[PDB]
Amino acid sequence: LTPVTLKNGVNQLDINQDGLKDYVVLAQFDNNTSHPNLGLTFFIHRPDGGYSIMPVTNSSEFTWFDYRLSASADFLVQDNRLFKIKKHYYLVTARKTEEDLFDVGKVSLTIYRFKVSRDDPGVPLYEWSMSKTVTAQRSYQSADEAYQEVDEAMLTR
Amino acid sequence: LTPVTLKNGVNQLDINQDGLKDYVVLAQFDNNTSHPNLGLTFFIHRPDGGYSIMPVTNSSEFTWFDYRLSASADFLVQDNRLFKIKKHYYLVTARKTEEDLFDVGKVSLTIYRFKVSRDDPGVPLYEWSMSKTVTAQRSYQSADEAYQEVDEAMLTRH
Numbered sequence: 522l523t524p525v526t527l528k529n530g531v532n533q534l535d536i537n538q539d540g541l542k543d544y545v546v547l548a549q550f551d552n553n554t555s556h557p558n559l560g561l562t563f564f565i566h567r568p569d570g571g572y573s574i575m576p577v578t579n580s581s582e583f584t585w586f587d588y589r590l591s592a593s594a595d596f597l598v599q600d601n602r603l604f605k606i607k608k609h610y611y612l613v614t615a616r617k618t619e620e621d622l623f624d625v626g627k628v629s630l631t632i633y634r635f636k637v638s639r640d641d642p643g644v645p646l647y648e649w650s651m652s653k654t655v656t657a658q659r660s661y662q663s664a665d666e667a668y669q670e671v672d673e674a675m676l677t678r
Numbered sequence: 679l680t681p682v683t684l685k686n687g688v689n690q691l692d693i694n695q696d697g698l699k700d701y702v703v704l705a706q707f708d709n710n711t712s713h714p715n716l717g718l719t720f721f722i723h724r725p726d727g728g729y730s731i732m733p734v735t736n737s738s739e740f741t742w743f744d745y746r747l748s749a750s751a752d753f754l755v756q757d758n759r760l761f762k763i764k765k766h767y768y769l770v771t772a773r774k775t776e777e778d779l780f781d782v783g784k785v786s787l788t789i790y791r792f793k794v795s796r797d798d799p800g801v802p803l804y805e806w807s808m809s810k811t812v813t814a815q816r817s818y819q820s821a822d823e824a825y826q827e828v829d830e831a832m833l834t835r836h
């Protein structure tokens with residue numbers, strides 16, 4: 522188990538383990554605040570030379586953004602982070618789940634697998650598909666603190 | 679006007695023309711239909727080394743997609759294309775404007791120019807800002823056909 526660090530911009534990773542390097546692009550949306558929201562955009566390299574942009578699950582968006590409560594305090598309400606076991610990549614969303622998002626609180630970790638669907642019309646060819654949601658053991662100020670609990674048994678089924 | 683030649687994937691182009699290469703990513707949304715939806719995603723290189731993802735104007739999205747009337751249609755209702763005049767880049771959206779999208783019809787061309795809005799409250803730092811919309815002078819089956827009318831005079835403000 523490795524959490525996967527990402528460089529600003531293009532990261533060449535082989536998310537679907539087929540020998541062609543894909544892109545994970547790490548960028549931020551700058552709309553002029555102290556803590557711009559970082560977003561991840563996934564592009565799967567196709568053998569025909571095209572790049573297939575992956576959707577956000579349960580969304581019409583194609584970039585996975587972090588979320589912060591307002592312009593102001595330095596903590597995350599929602600975060601995303603990539604993990605890898607051997608050749609397999611997993612995307613994990615950490616989210617503060619209590620009503621008072623400002624306080625130290627419970628955090629849910631949603632584990633997504635890479636899923637290829639080749640088959641049903643109108644379904645994405647390449648998507649992140651939920652495998653497991655767990656509640657972190659500790660309460661935290663910032664969602665990203667929960668990733669310190671992620672281990673091999675939590676990612677796999 | 680010949681459009682900007684994009685390769686599939688990352689195109690390293692200096693969109694705001696400040697000397698730092700930015701990314702224009704050409705990709706497709708594959709959703710088990712007869713046609714992929716082609717999309718452009720823009721990332722502006724910042725001095726601190728970060729990349730700033732540009733929003734789609736008047737939208738919650740961050741990729742500019744082409745659009746068809748239905749899964750199997752062999753024409754576009756909406757397209758986007760990059761052009762360049764001297765050092766400036768212009769994003770041009772072609773859209774079929776009539777309710778009856780299936781028939782040959784009027785197409786609009788919305789020209790966007792690059793705009794920086796620095797330290798301005800809650801406004802995107804980097805955006806495509808509408809310069810002008812023009813109605814193409816011929817009616818077309820597919821919106822991308824109207825790019826044949828694009829020229830220097832259409833693109834630049836002065």
Ligand code: NA
Binds near residue numbers: 536538
């Ligand atoms: Na790959």
Ligand code: NA
Binds near residue numbers: 698
């Ligand atoms: Na630039």
